[PDB]
Amino acid sequence: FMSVYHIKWIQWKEENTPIITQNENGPCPLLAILNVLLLAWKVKLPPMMEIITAEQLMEYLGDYMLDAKPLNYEQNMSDAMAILHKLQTGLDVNVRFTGVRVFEYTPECIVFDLLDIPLYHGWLVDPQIDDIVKAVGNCSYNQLVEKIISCKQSDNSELVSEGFVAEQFLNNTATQLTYHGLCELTSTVQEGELCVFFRNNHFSTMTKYKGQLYLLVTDQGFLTEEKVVWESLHNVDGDGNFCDSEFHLRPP
Ligand SMILES: [Cl-]
């Protein structure tokens, strides 16, 4: 399977900087990870370049690992390279609902750790609602759907309660971003940090500028719109504000 991606050239901190736009693959982890490294100027593309294969994207990412090498790192780099192909053949990312950096460990955590790129989500139980805090506890998404099923079958009333309360949480927060998650993300990401944001099995490049969270606009529809670079993340539901590469509102 050969995939081709269109490169958008933007002015990022007053320097000519490429971003990879999504094709049929959509907002896959590979684009979100690459775009962090391109914006950080840790990977440079040829100034010509308009188009790039998934294969070349992979070569660039693996070359960046051998170049950023500073015996066991060899194993980890090799394991990361094998795992790196899962970044195109599905990533099973499993959040916990207790913190913006908390996920169930899967071997793909090897890639983010070796690349030293932070991974975040904002699917967070509101700590002010005690029955949800207790019902969800430390569950991963996958553990909670299992807990719901087990707990509804229980002869113990309390456990049947936690089951229904956990189901209510999943139904009511099905967008996979909560207001509390958005607040914890905003205060946790540092000014100018480049990072990956996980929501609804989609990966986005995220930054913070003057206290405000933005997602990099990767949608193919905006390839020639130089003034659409960032989208504000300021609410759980509805569209953010489209901004240029300097975070100013795109004129209507
Ligand atoms: Cl800036």
Numbering used by the authors: 239 to 308, 317 to 498
Tell me, in the authors' exact words, what the paper reports.
In MINDY1 and MINDY2, a flexible loop (T130 to P138 in MINDY1 and T259 to P267 in MINDY2) connects β2 to α1, which we term the Cys loop since the catalytic cysteine sits at its base. In the apo-form of the DUB, this Cys loop occludes the catalytic center and would sterically hinder positioning of the scissile bond across the active site. The only significant change is in the Cys loop that undergoes significant remodeling, during which several hydrogen bonds are broken, accompanied by the formation of new bonds. This extensive interaction network and remodeling of the Cys loop is also observed in MINDY2, and when restructured, the Cys loop no longer impedes Ub binding. In contrast, in MINDY2apo, the catalytic H448 is flipped out, and Q260 is not able to form a hydrogen bond. However, the binding of Ubprox brings H448 closer to the catalytic C266 to form a productive active site. For both MINDY2 apo and MINDY2∼Ub complex, computed data from the models yielded good agreement with the experiment, confirming the two structures in solution.
MINDY1 and MINDY2 are members of the MINDY family of deubiquitinases (DUBs) that have exquisite specificity for cleaving K48-polyUb, yet we have a poor understanding of their catalytic mechanism. Here, we analyze the crystal structures of MINDY1 and MINDY2 alone and in complex with monoUb, di-, and penta-K48-polyUb, identifying 5 distinct Ub binding sites in the catalytic domain that explain how these DUBs sense both Ub chain length and linkage type to cleave K48-polyUb chains. The activity of MINDY1/2 is inhibited by the Cys-loop, and we find that substrate interaction relieves autoinhibition to activate these DUBs. We also find that MINDY1/2 use a non-canonical catalytic triad composed of Cys-His-Thr.
